Amino acid sequence: REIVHIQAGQCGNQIGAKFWEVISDEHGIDPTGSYHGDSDLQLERINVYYNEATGNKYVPRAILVDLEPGTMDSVRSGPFGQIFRPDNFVFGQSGAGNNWAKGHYTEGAELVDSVLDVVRKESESCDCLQGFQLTHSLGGGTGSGMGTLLISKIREEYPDRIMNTFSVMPSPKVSDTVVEPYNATLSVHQLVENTDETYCIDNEALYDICFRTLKLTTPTYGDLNHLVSATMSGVTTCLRFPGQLNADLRKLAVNMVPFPRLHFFMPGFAPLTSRGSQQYRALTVPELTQQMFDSKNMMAACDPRHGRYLTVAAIFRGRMSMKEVDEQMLNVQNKNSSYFVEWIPNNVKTAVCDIPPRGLKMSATFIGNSTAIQELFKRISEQFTAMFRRKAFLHWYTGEGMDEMEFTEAESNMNDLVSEYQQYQDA
Amino acid sequence: MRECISIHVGQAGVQIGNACWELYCLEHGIQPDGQMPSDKTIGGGDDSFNTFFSETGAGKHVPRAVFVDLEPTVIDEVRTGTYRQLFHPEQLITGKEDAANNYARGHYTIGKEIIDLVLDRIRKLADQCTGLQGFLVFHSFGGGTGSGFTSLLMERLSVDYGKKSKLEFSIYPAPQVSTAVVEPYNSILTTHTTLEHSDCAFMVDNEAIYDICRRNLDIERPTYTNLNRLISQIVSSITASLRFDGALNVDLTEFQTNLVPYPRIHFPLATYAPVISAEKAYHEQLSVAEITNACFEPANQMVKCDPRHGKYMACCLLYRGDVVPKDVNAAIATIKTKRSIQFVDWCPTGFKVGINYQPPTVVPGGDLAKVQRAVCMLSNTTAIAEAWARLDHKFDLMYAKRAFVHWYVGEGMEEGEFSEAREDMAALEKDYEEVGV
Amino acid sequence: MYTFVVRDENSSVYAEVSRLLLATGQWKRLRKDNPRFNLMLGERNRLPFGRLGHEPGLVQLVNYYRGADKLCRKASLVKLIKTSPELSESCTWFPESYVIYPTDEREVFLAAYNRRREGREGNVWIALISSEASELLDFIDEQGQVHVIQKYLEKPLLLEPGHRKFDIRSWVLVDHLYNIYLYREGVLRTSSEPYNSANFQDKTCHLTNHCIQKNYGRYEEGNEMFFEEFNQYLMDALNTTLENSILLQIKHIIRSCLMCIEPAISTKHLHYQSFQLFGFDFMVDEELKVWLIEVNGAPACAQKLYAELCQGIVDVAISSVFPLATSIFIKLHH
Amino acid sequence: MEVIELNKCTSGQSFEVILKPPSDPSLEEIQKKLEAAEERRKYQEAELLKHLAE
Ligand SMILES: Nc1nc2c(ncn2[C@@H]2O[C@H](COP(=O)(O)OP(=O)(O)OP(=O)(O)O)[C@@H](O)[C@H]2O)c(=O)[nH]1
Ligand SMILES: Nc1ncnc2c1ncn2[C@@H]1O[C@H](COP(=O)(O)OP(=O)(O)CP(=O)(O)O)[C@@H](O)[C@H]1O
Numbered sequence A: 001r002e003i004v005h006i007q008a009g010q011c012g013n014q015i016g017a018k019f020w021e022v023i024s025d026e027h028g029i030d031p032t033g034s035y036h037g038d039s040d041l042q043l044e045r046i047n048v049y050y051n052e053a054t055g056n057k058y059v060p061r062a063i064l065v066d067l068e069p070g071t072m073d074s075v076r077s078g079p080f081g082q083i084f085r086p087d088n089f090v091f092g093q094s095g096a097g098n099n100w101a102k103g104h105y106t107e108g109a110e111l112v113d114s115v116l117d118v119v120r121k122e123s124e125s126c127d128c129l130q131g132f133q134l135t136h137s138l139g140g141g142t143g144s145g146m147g148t149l150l151i152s153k154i155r156e157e158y159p160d161r162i163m164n165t166f167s168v169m170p171s172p173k174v175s176d177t178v179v180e181p182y183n184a185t186l187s188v189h190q191l192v193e194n195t196d197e198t199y200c201i202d203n204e205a206l207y208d209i210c211f212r213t214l215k216l217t218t219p220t221y222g223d224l225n226h227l228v229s230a231t232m233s234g235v236t237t238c239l240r241f242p243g244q245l246n247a248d249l250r251k252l253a254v255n256m257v258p259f260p261r262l263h264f265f266m267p268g269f270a271p272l273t274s275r276g277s278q279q280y281r282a283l284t285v286p287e288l289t290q291q292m293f294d295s296k297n298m299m300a301a302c303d304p305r306h307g308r309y310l311t312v313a314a315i316f317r318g319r320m321s322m323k324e325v326d327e328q329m330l331n332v333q334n335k336n337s338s339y340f341v342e343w344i345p346n347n348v349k350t351a352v353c354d355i356p357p358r359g360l361k362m363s364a365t366f367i368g369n370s371t372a373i374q375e376l377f378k379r380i381s382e383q384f385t386a387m388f389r390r391k392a393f394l395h396w397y398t399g400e401g402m403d404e405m406e407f408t409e410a411e412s413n414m415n416d417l418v419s420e421y422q423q424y425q426d427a
Numbered sequence B: 001m002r003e004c005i006s007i008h009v010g011q012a013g014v015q016i017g018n019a020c021w022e023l024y025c026l027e028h029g030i031q032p033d034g035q036m037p038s039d040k041t042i043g044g045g046d047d048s049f050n051t052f053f054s055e056t057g058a059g060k061h062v063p064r065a066v067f068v069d070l071e072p073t074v075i076d077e078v079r080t081g082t083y084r085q086l087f088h089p090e091q092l093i094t095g096k097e098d099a100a101n102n103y104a105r106g107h108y109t110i111g112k113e114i115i116d117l118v119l120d121r122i123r124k125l126a127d128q129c130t131g132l133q134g135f136l137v138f139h140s141f142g143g144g145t146g147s148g149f150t151s152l153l154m155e156r157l158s159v160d161y162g163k164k165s166k167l168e169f170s171i172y173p174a175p176q177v178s179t180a181v182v183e184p185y186n187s188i189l190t191t192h193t194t195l196e197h198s199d200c201a202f203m204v205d206n207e208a209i210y211d212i213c214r215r216n217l218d219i220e221r222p223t224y225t226n227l228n229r230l231i232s233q234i235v236s237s238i239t240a241s242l243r244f245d246g247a248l249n250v251d252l253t254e255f256q257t258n259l260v261p262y263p264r265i266h267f268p269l270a271t272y273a274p275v276i277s278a279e280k281a282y283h284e285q286l287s288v289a290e291i292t293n294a295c296f297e298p299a300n301q302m303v304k305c306d307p308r309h310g311k312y313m314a315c316c317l318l319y320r321g322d323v324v325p326k327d328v329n330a331a332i333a334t335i336k337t338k339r340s341i342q343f344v345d346w347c348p349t350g351f352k353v354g355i356n357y358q359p360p361t362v363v364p365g366g367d368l369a370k371v372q373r374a375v376c377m378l379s380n381t382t383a384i385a386e387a388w389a390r391l392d393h394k395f396d397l398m399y400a401k402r403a404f405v406h407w408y409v410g411e412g413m414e415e416g417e418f419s420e421a422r423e424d425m426a427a428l429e430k431d432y433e434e435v436g437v
Numbered sequence C: 001m002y003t004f005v006v007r008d009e010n011s012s013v014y015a016e017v018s019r020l021l022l023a024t025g026q027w028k029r030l031r032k033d034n035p036r037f038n039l040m041l042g043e044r045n046r047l048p049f050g051r052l053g054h055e056p057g058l059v060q061l062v063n064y065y066r067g068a069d070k071l072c073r074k075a076s077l078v079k080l081i082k083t084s085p086e087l088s089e090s091c092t093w094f095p096e097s098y099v100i101y102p103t104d105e106r107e108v109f110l111a112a113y114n115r116r117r118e119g120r121e122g123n124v125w126i127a128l129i130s131s132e133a134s135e136l137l138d139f140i141d142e143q144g145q146v147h148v149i150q151k152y153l154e155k156p157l158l159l160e161p162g163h164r165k166f167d168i169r170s171w172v173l174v175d176h177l178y179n180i181y182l183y184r185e186g187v188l189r190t191s192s193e194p195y196n197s198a199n200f201q202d203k204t205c206h207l208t209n210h211c212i213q214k215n216y217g218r219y220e221e222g223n224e225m226f227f228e229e230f231n232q233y234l235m236d237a238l239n240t241t242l243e244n245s246i247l248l249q250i251k252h253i254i255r256s257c258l259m260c261i262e263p264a265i266s267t268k269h270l271h272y273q274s275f276q277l278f279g280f281d282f283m284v285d286e287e288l289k290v291w292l293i294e295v296n297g298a299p300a301c302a303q304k305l306y307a308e309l310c311q312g313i314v315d316v317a318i319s320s321v322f323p324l325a326t327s328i329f330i331k332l333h334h
Numbered sequence D: 001m002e003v004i005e006l007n008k009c010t011s012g013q014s015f016e017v018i019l020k021p022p023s024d025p026s027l028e029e030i031q032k033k034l035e036a037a038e039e040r041r042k043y044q045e046a047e048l049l050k051h052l053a054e
């Protein structure tokens, strides 16, 4: 089962690039695309993300999208820049000016068909395409506006394929422009309808983690992206390496998503580590379990103690006692069974993979479907309303053809999403 | 002689089929290439083992089996496995994308595009049969294929083969081994749809096999391989009377006669003893009395429940190894005075005993030790309904919130089938209670 | 940090137990339908034993023995005794009883009393009390539910001052190992009406229940005489003790009853574990012979003894399985 | 107590011991239900493509 990767916009391409940088190192694939590992567990699930190229070369099934050439030229001149299929570089020239409308309705519309042609060309080769994954931010114009336009048009042409996203949430602590709450809200409406799994990566959380925890006075986007590539690598581990789990994206989605609109996940990761700073002490399993469940390790600035877990997925990596893992996992649930819903039996599932990430001897990745995620959406909704009650900065959008009603609708749908999460928090 | 066709559906069914046929071959002295030196009727025969194997002119002994999965990777490991030459391609059938642990997807959506093919490949086996008794169907309750495609198949077989019997080997879902969360939905659905189409079903709770593997084989975390080699032993005990000379349970019809007095209540509890570790340096061989006594210990049952708080309708004892009727009758007499064994008033309180002198065969390099005598008890006790109660409760919890339901409805299924299936199960729980108290 | 649940709110004994557990600061109460518990304080009716011991990573314990109702209900107890060889119909400490279904053990019931008609032997029975069988044979028929008719002790031991009737209540705890623990503190639930050998058409005189007598508070507060008193009265008025004259027979009847059904309810090798508190109700005749009247599966305690007993339950039945970071019981050995 | 129907052979023997005496849908509806569920999908797929067309 093959996956098609797409990365849209500045944020989208920068985390996406570092993702391919990380997992290409895991799979032993080099900057040119030649395998150079020791294990062959490196290769029997490598067609999931890579295409086999003549000359024993491997090429990412990756499509790079932007309305500006700036970031994608940085990617191409980046460390693993030349690994990517050059035709998969689809870009405009005007940019989106952090404007959802430009990305979704005007500038992006002009470019979207060209992108879909590259998608179609990839899907055609896939013996059994299982789904798509997108990397983008929701605060800008391209990744937000055009990214959701792509998702909408991909669902039209592939209604029966899984669509997952890694979606970076905006935050005033890490902000480019004031209109990010507007762009975010418009995009959430789109994600609620047309995605199976959306990993909610809050820039607030990524910041706090870098400063409060990781001893970084002034964290850059590069530091923030260390955390994101580590997490993306962890959530996809089970699909990239052989193990216990005989599951595709669909089977995995079925067991995580009891309700179609409630598919926004809190990612987490342990041990939390800065880049450069070595780790000499390997965590015990009880430490891995304790940390990956602690809020300070969550990538979404939500307090899981303010909600209840609908489902939970956990992926331990490295050489460890599978027994001890079960005890510690079963321990946490039996410790705090009040923070798990009782009306979904056995809703916490675990998997183990013998291959650890680079630099760590063992690690865990947390995927939580908590109702506490409403805190994230309430946050955006407040920032949205504060401006919208005065119709502030709205001319940037109405100048591209949008009406106020579309904002009112988007606002309502997210307040609905919030109220829906609240319904199951009191069940 | 009358032939039996084994149908293995889904991952659990396939990999368990592998375990069984591997074991069968060892018990009949058939090698991986299908050659059976001891068979002197080259090219054919009328023997008891021909119940499960047919013969080619070249002298190959091929299973009367069909493997079917909605996704290739599991059966591909049969196409390239050590017993690859044993089967032939038309016996192994694979779709491209599985049912994603979705009953509706396996039954309705993806089931439809492959049902006519499987029945054809099955019909090609039945045409090689001079007298077909019926089918042995291996599958999981929790898998979308194992649950959804099985009920679809079981419906058609009752149409294409009305007079033929159909037995089930069913894997009851356990959280310790499972990973799906929706297996209770799949289990209730497939039981509801298969109930009138199954003459006799042997439930195996992965929870029970798992603990048996930990407790008695000293395996810290059992793999499917560990579970399946133990399950194959039990299944081999249950089917030995179809593959070997004897007078007890010689055809599928007798299984229902001896074990299933009332059709709906056709879930006999299996209990197996002794299970001994091969890495166990020092072992004291157990007696007919000891292994027979172990048959009334809950820790040896395929499903954990308490037969003391229910009633029996039937009870077969199948022995393998050094056993004589005299020792059995003494062991039975002793146990009865010490244990609580209540039958229903309209049943004779007695035991049907089968003995095969050949002791149980073990897979070389397996976890199980060779023993001088072993036994499998098949008891139709109402206590097994505890397993239905567990399952039905989990179903109720999720369904009250309609959790995950949208996955099924999105495949064309109606929400009404959920409630219908659950009401049928609610009836089934009461059938057991009428009889049991 | 262990966890437990409460599914019986009317339990005067285990509401007290739940309180003690929380006070240790090492137990946590979940809600009725949370499966991830260590201990279950279940309901009296339709308790789902079939769902216990199937939670991975959890040792589970319940405060009831499945199947123990065959001892704790009148129709069953009679059948239990009569059919069980270790007890038999020759059993010397159970009043001659018979099972009687409404319009079975009626034809036999008639035969037993037919010499009692003309044997010039004491011929009074109880379901209520009567000398005429016909009068209560279709009192049962007017009620609707199956009844038990039983030998009536018309020559009971009588407490003076007062010339009164009484019954003894013993609290027994059976832990997970099937150790049978007798609570050293019992209670006499005494009548205050002088026992009337003639007219039993009243209830107060021949029925010693704690409810129906509310002659209350005359000789002892509560109509409730404890063992220190009853022992003293025995020493002064009959020159014997409680242990010798009565308790040996009590410990013998208790042990005989639970050992009879041990192989039917024991959780020795089960996936879940049981314990349970029982209340045995005895009665003494004038020859100091103790008769078993009944066994209560869901017994309530005496108010002075709640604190001590309920603390004992935690010590040997719960903490014995779930340990934390001289004895009030008498072990009946076997 | 009473052993009956003792059958013996080289492979083994079998008998019965009594300790106490006592005291379908046609292919009509299958393919009808399968197709009635198929156009429940088609209807759902149509309303999606309609919704997307809007
Ligand atoms: N005993 C045993 N159980 C298994 C085995 N494989 C899977 N299972 C159980 O089967 C259930 C999942 O069903 P599967 O058989 O894997 O699913 P399937 O029939 O292939 O159907 P799909 O959903 O389409 O994959 C879980 O409860 C597993 O514990 C096996 O080899 N042995
Ligand atoms: N055979 C008998 N002879 C004399 N008195 C008897 C008797 N059977 C019952 N009694 C009287 O009836 C009282 C209680 O009746 P019984 O025990 O049958 O009902 P009960 O269940 O309400 C007691 P508990 O409620 O504590 O279980 C006894 O305490 C005793 O006073």
Ligand SMILES: Nc1nc2c(ncn2[C@@H]2O[C@H](COP(=O)(O)OP(=O)(O)O)[C@@H](O)[C@H]2O)c(=O)[nH]1
Binding pocket: A008, A009, A010, A011, A012, A014, A015, A096, A097, A098, A099, A137, A138, A139, A140, A141, A142, A143, A144, A168, A169, A170, A171, A174, A175, A176, A180, A203, A221, A222, A224, A225, A228
């Ligand atoms: N984590 C992370 N967030 C980013 C990065 N670049 C931009 N963002 C966030 O994304 C939003 C801006 O979107 P951007 O991708 O730059 O707009 P676009 O290129 O037009 O789609 C803001 O909320 C930024 O904080 C990045 O490299 N990493």
Ligand SMILES: c1ccc(CNc2cc3c(cn2)[nH]c2ccccc23)cc1
Binding pocket: A133, A164, A165, A197, A235, A236, A238, A239, A245, A249, A252, A253, A255, A256, A312, A313, A314, A315, A349, A350, A351, A367
């Ligand atoms: C793109 C591609 C792939 C992924 C990962 N998806 C995923 C993984 C798991 C899951 C639900 N979804 N449930 C699990 C339980 C145990 C182990 C793993 C998982 C996201 C984006």
Ligand SMILES: [Ca+2]
Binding pocket: B039, B040, B041, B042, B043, B044, B045, B046, B055
């Ligand atoms: Ca032959």
Ligand SMILES: [Mg+2]
Binding pocket: A010, A140, A176
């Ligand atoms: Mg930018």
Ligand SMILES: [Mg+2]
Binding pocket: A246, B010, B011, B071, B098, B143, B145
């Ligand atoms: Mg499968």
